[PDB]
């Protein structure tokens, strides 16, 4: 049992909240330990495992096992307290310093993220901070993909972080309250500002690499939009209208995406699916275009 | 300032207790040279006196190390040289069958000293020490995570260990298959421990620059959270 590990997890949270450590270097270590701990606790299991455990509890027909759920609950309580405090510290920190330590802190934020999805965090986090900052950072994401060539190097830093940021955004969108916060932050606006979509990627390093990369950005952002759309009530709701505007305004890209090949094709294929999901999920983009 | 004197006193006194305890175990000692114990219990002693007289002649490397911690002696060469001796001494006693046994004892010895020093970087250069340990243990059977686990137990945080280790990873021009494995074990150890990190993007991870955290950092931010420590 990684019970012994639990104590270290507590110490880590303590130090972070305290934000002692002149070195972000120190905090990077704390973030790394926390990341592993969160990951370790839930060995890759998916909703099926949870459903099986619930049934067994079903009810305690005899002696049940509910060990992993119990462990997750304890982790989440600890984390909550310490949490509000530490969320503040973790996000601010974020930005700066450490573009480095960043790779570590964004990964920590994402793991944490699943668990403690649901709950808790959405409220806290919401507010603050994050949203504002993260949406603005979408705009800047577009700019950051170009700056991407330069910095291929400084890339190492940022791949660990930028990808982590997209993931964090996608995860927030997966749930109702999270999607609402992102959308409130003016996601569509930042995306319009990034101008990632309102262009043609082909227009324009070995060229297939750049296409893979650009399309890659498009697939994640497109997933974030689709997830935000569906995650609310995609119908009469306001969300449906916003997504439709997204499609029409960035039409012809959707159409253009539909045919061709490579790993680039693979990325293209995923992008195509993502648009399709956006389409049906909304009022059928086609349906709207009666 | 009274407090200042009192605490220093407690620290030095503790050292004598440790030295005293070891003297009992040590078989190099003669009972009639009880005089040493009388001296130890009798009063606080000069650090240099403790170091030169006791630690070196009785080869208590651990004690010497702890003492220099209190002294706050920074000199890396001397500190490292002392470390080399401790490691070398450890090799002598070992026989091989106890790869695991020695594995434990080794971890035990290191963790204890590590807990005392780990707070300060001079005696416990995490960066310098980790490889040194791996290198030492390398001439032994291996299971991944054996090296890092000791540091975690030592009192080192998951976050601290991660950044330094990553640096070790990227910094080295080389194979470091070992580091990759251990870090792999570290991440796995960490995620399970906190609920915060927990889940699926992970299992795939088999240590590379495919840092799960690295990706996380890029998107959300570097802010992991507060330091996470082993319970």
Residue numbers in the entry:
A (entry chain V): 1392 to 1595, 1607 to 1692
B (entry chain W): 1139 to 1312, 1319 to 1375
What does the published report state?
Nuclear pore complexes (NPCs) create large conduits for cargo transport between the nucleus and cytoplasm across the nuclear envelope (NE). These multi-megadalton structures are composed of about thirty different nucleoporins that are distributed in three main substructures (the inner, cytoplasmic and nucleoplasmic rings) around the central transport channel. Here we use cryo-electron tomography on DLD-1 cells that were prepared using cryo-focused-ion-beam milling to generate a structural model for the human NPC in its native environment. Our findings highlight the inherent flexibility of the NPC and suggest that the cellular environment has a considerable influence on NPC dimensions and architecture.
FG-Nups (Nup54, Nup58 and Nup62) are docked to the IR to create the central channel for transport. For the IR, we first docked the published composite model containing Nup93, Nup188/Nup205, Nup155 and the Nup62–Nup58–Nup54 complex. Although this model fits well, some elements appear to be shifted, suggesting that flexibility in the IR Nups may account for the larger diameter that we observed. Propagated through the entire IR, these rearrangements explain how the central channel becomes larger. The Nup93 and Nup205 subunits of adjacent IR structures form a pseudo-lock-and-key configuration in the constricted IR model; by contrast, here these components shifted to create gaps between the IR subunits. However, the diameter of the central channel is considerably different —it is about 33% larger (width, about 57 nm) compared with previous models (width, about 43 nm).
